[PDB]
Coordinates of all heavy atoms in Angstrom, one line a residue:
Chain D
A48 N 53.0 14.2 -3.2 CA 52.5 15.5 -2.9 C 53.0 16.2 -1.6 O 52.8 17.4 -1.4 CB 51.0 15.5 -2.9
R49 N 53.6 15.4 -0.7 CA 54.0 15.9 0.6 C 55.5 16.2 0.7 O 56.1 15.9 1.7 CB 53.4 15.0 1.7 CG 53.9 13.5 1.6 CD 53.3 12.7 2.7 NE 51.8 12.8 2.8 CZ 51.1 11.9 2.1 NH1 51.6 11.0 1.3 NH2 49.7 12.0 2.2
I50 N 56.0 16.7 -0.4 CA 57.4 17.1 -0.5 C 57.4 18.6 -0.3 O 56.4 19.3 -0.8 CB 58.0 16.7 -1.8 CG1 57.9 15.1 -2.0 CG2 59.5 17.0 -1.9 CD1 58.6 14.4 -0.9
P51 N 58.4 19.2 0.4 CA 58.4 20.7 0.4 C 58.6 21.4 -0.9 O 59.1 20.8 -1.9 CB 59.7 21.0 1.3 CG 59.8 19.8 2.1 CD 59.3 18.6 1.3
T52 N 58.0 22.6 -1.1 CA 58.1 23.3 -2.3 C 58.2 24.8 -2.0 O 57.5 25.3 -1.2 CB 56.9 23.0 -3.2 OG1 56.7 21.6 -3.4 CG2 57.1 23.5 -4.6
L53 N 59.1 25.5 -2.7 CA 59.4 26.9 -2.5 C 58.3 27.7 -3.2 O 58.1 27.6 -4.4 CB 60.8 27.2 -3.0 CG 62.0 26.9 -2.1 CD1 62.3 25.5 -2.1 CD2 63.1 27.8 -2.5
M54 N 57.6 28.6 -2.4 CA 56.6 29.5 -3.0 C 57.2 30.6 -3.8 O 58.4 30.7 -4.0 CB 55.8 30.0 -1.8 CG 55.0 29.0 -1.1 SD 54.1 29.7 0.3 CE 52.8 30.7 -0.5
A55 N 56.4 31.5 -4.3 CA 56.8 32.5 -5.2 C 56.0 33.8 -5.0 O 54.7 33.7 -5.0 CB 56.8 32.1 -6.6
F56 N 56.6 34.9 -4.7 CA 55.9 36.1 -4.3 C 56.3 37.3 -5.2 O 57.3 37.3 -6.0 CB 56.3 36.5 -2.9 CG 55.7 35.7 -1.9 CD1 56.3 35.6 -0.6 CD2 54.5 35.0 -2.2 CE1 55.7 34.8 0.3 CE2 53.9 34.2 -1.2 CZ 54.5 34.1 0.0
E57 N 55.5 38.4 -5.2 CA 55.8 39.6 -5.9 C 56.9 40.3 -5.1 O 56.8 40.4 -3.9 CB 54.6 40.5 -6.1 CG 54.8 41.6 -7.0 CD 53.6 42.4 -7.3 OE1 52.5 42.1 -6.7 OE2 53.7 43.4 -8.1
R58 N 57.8 40.8 -5.8 CA 59.0 41.6 -5.2 C 58.5 42.9 -4.7 O 57.6 43.5 -5.3 CB 60.1 41.8 -6.3 CG 61.3 42.4 -5.8 CD 62.0 41.5 -4.8 NE 63.3 42.1 -4.3 CZ 64.5 41.8 -4.8 NH1 64.6 41.0 -5.8 NH2 65.5 42.4 -4.3
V59 N 59.1 43.3 -3.6 CA 58.8 44.6 -2.9 C 59.2 45.7 -3.9 O 60.0 45.5 -4.8 CB 59.6 44.7 -1.6 CG1 59.0 43.7 -0.6 CG2 61.1 44.4 -1.9
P60 N 58.6 47.0 -3.7 CA 58.8 48.0 -4.8 C 60.2 48.5 -5.0 O 60.5 49.6 -4.7 CB 57.9 49.1 -4.3 CG 56.9 48.5 -3.5 CD 57.6 47.4 -2.8
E61 N 61.0 47.6 -5.6 CA 62.3 47.8 -6.2 C 62.4 46.9 -7.4 O 62.9 45.8 -7.2 CB 63.4 47.7 -5.2 CG 64.8 48.2 -5.8 CD 65.6 47.2 -6.4 OE1 65.5 46.0 -6.0 OE2 66.3 47.5 -7.4
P62 N 61.8 47.2 -8.5 CA 61.8 46.2 -9.6 C 63.2 46.1 -10.3 O 63.6 47.0 -11.1 CB 60.7 46.7 -10.6 CG 60.6 48.2 -10.3 CD 60.9 48.3 -8.8
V63 N 63.9 45.0 -10.0 CA 65.1 44.8 -10.7 C 64.8 44.4 -12.2 O 64.0 43.5 -12.4 CB 66.0 43.7 -10.1 CG1 67.2 43.4 -10.9 CG2 66.3 44.1 -8.7
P64 N 65.4 45.0 -13.2 CA 65.0 44.8 -14.6 C 65.4 43.4 -15.1 O 65.2 43.1 -16.3 CB 65.7 45.9 -15.4 CG 66.0 47.0 -14.4 CD 66.3 46.2 -13.1
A65 N 66.0 42.5 -14.3 CA 66.3 41.2 -14.6 C 65.1 40.4 -14.8 O 64.0 40.8 -14.5 CB 67.2 40.5 -13.6
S66 N 65.2 39.2 -15.4 CA 64.0 38.4 -15.9 C 63.3 37.9 -14.7 O 63.8 37.3 -13.8 CB 64.5 37.2 -16.8 OG 63.4 36.4 -17.1
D67 N 62.0 38.1 -14.7 CA 61.0 37.6 -13.7 C 61.3 37.9 -12.3 O 61.6 37.1 -11.5 CB 60.9 36.1 -13.9 CG 60.3 35.7 -15.3 OD1 59.5 36.5 -15.8 OD2 60.7 34.6 -15.8
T68 N 61.2 39.2 -11.9 CA 61.6 39.7 -10.6 C 60.6 39.2 -9.6 O 59.7 40.0 -9.1 CB 61.8 41.2 -10.6 OG1 62.5 41.6 -11.7 CG2 62.5 41.7 -9.3
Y69 N 60.6 38.0 -9.2 CA 59.8 37.3 -8.2 C 60.6 36.5 -7.3 O 61.6 35.9 -7.7 CB 58.7 36.4 -8.9 CG 57.5 37.2 -9.4 CD1 56.7 36.7 -10.4 CD2 57.1 38.4 -8.9 CE1 55.6 37.3 -10.9 CE2 56.1 39.1 -9.4 CZ 55.3 38.5 -10.4 OH 54.2 39.2 -10.8
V70 N 60.3 36.4 -6.0 CA 61.2 36.2 -5.0 C 60.7 35.1 -4.0 O 59.6 35.2 -3.5 CB 61.5 37.5 -4.2 CG1 60.3 38.3 -3.9 CG2 62.2 37.3 -2.9
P71 N 61.5 34.1 -3.8 CA 61.2 33.1 -2.8 C 61.7 33.3 -1.5 O 62.2 32.4 -0.9 CB 61.8 31.8 -3.4 CG 63.0 32.3 -4.1 CD 62.7 33.7 -4.7
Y72 N 61.6 34.5 -0.9 CA 61.9 34.8 0.5 C 61.2 36.0 0.9 O 60.4 36.6 0.2 CB 63.4 34.9 0.7 CG 64.2 35.9 -0.1 CD1 64.3 37.2 0.3 CD2 64.8 35.5 -1.3 CE1 65.0 38.1 -0.4 CE2 65.6 36.4 -2.0 CZ 65.6 37.7 -1.6 OH 66.3 38.6 -2.3
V73 N 61.6 36.5 2.1 CA 61.0 37.7 2.8 C 62.2 38.6 3.2 O 63.1 38.1 3.9 CB 60.1 37.3 3.9 CG1 59.6 38.6 4.6 CG2 58.9 36.5 3.5
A74 N 62.1 39.8 2.9 CA 63.1 40.8 3.3 C 62.5 41.6 4.4 O 61.6 42.5 4.2 CB 63.5 41.8 2.2
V75 N 62.8 41.3 5.7 CA 62.2 42.0 6.8 C 62.9 43.3 7.0 O 64.1 43.5 6.9 CB 62.4 41.1 8.1 CG1 63.8 40.6 8.3 CG2 62.0 41.9 9.3
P76 N 62.1 44.4 7.1 CA 62.7 45.7 7.3 C 63.0 46.0 8.7 O 62.5 45.4 9.7 CB 61.5 46.6 6.8 CG 60.3 45.9 7.2 CD 60.6 44.5 7.0
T77 N 63.9 47.0 8.9 CA 64.3 47.4 10.3 C 63.2 48.3 10.9 O 63.1 48.3 12.2 CB 65.6 48.1 10.3 OG1 65.5 49.3 9.5 CG2 66.7 47.2 9.6
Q78 N 62.4 49.0 10.1 CA 61.6 50.1 10.6 C 60.4 49.5 11.3 O 59.8 48.5 10.9 CB 61.2 51.0 9.4 CG 60.8 52.4 9.8 CD 59.3 52.4 10.1 OE1 58.5 51.6 9.6 NE2 58.9 53.4 10.9
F79 N 59.9 50.3 12.3 CA 58.8 49.9 13.1 C 57.5 50.4 12.4 O 57.2 51.6 12.3 CB 58.8 50.5 14.5 CG 57.7 50.2 15.3 CD1 57.5 48.9 15.9 CD2 56.7 51.1 15.7 CE1 56.4 48.6 16.7 CE2 55.6 50.8 16.5 CZ 55.5 49.6 17.0
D80 N 56.7 49.5 11.8 CA 55.4 49.7 11.4 C 54.5 48.6 11.8 O 55.0 47.5 12.0 CB 55.4 50.0 9.9 CG 56.1 48.9 9.1 OD1 56.7 48.1 9.7 OD2 56.1 49.0 7.8
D81 N 53.2 48.8 11.8 CA 52.3 47.8 12.4 C 51.4 47.2 11.4 O 50.2 47.0 11.6 CB 51.5 48.4 13.6 CG 51.0 47.4 14.6 OD1 51.8 46.9 15.4 OD2 49.8 47.1 14.6
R82 N 51.9 46.8 10.3 CA 51.3 46.0 9.3 C 52.1 44.8 9.0 O 53.3 44.8 9.2 CB 51.1 46.8 8.0 CG 52.4 47.2 7.3 CD 52.1 48.0 6.0 NE 51.6 49.3 6.4 CZ 50.3 49.7 6.1 NH1 49.5 48.9 5.5 NH2 49.9 50.9 6.4
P83 N 51.4 43.7 8.6 CA 52.2 42.4 8.5 C 53.2 42.3 7.4 O 53.3 43.2 6.5 CB 51.1 41.4 8.3 CG 49.9 42.1 7.8 CD 50.0 43.4 8.5
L84 N 54.1 41.3 7.5 CA 55.2 41.1 6.6 C 54.7 40.4 5.3 O 55.0 41.0 4.2 CB 56.2 40.2 7.3 CG 57.3 40.8 8.2 CD1 58.1 41.8 7.3 CD2 56.8 41.5 9.4
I85 N 54.0 39.3 5.4 CA 53.4 38.6 4.3 C 52.0 38.3 4.7 O 51.7 37.7 5.8 CB 54.2 37.4 3.8 CG1 55.5 37.9 3.1 CG2 53.4 36.7 2.7 CD1 55.3 38.7 1.9
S86 N 51.0 38.6 3.8 CA 49.6 38.3 3.9 C 49.2 37.7 2.5 O 49.2 38.4 1.5 CB 48.8 39.5 4.3 OG 49.1 39.9 5.6
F87 N 48.7 36.5 2.5 CA 48.2 35.9 1.3 C 47.0 35.0 1.5 O 46.9 34.4 2.6 CB 49.3 35.1 0.6 CG 49.8 33.9 1.3 CD1 49.3 32.7 1.2 CD2 50.9 34.1 2.1 CE1 49.8 31.6 1.9 CE2 51.5 33.1 2.9 CZ 50.9 31.8 2.7

Side-chain angles (χ1 to χ4, degrees):
Chain D
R49 54 179 61 86
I50 303 299
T52 309
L53 279 77
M54 294 177 70
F56 285 156
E57 191 176 3
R58 185 64 179 267
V59 294
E61 192 268 326
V63 176
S66 176
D67 295 328
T68 312
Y69 278 157
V70 45
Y72 56 86
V73 176
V75 50
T77 63
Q78 199 274 334
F79 180 74
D80 50 354
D81 201 75
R82 66 183 66 249
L84 274 300
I85 292 295
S86 295
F87 60 93

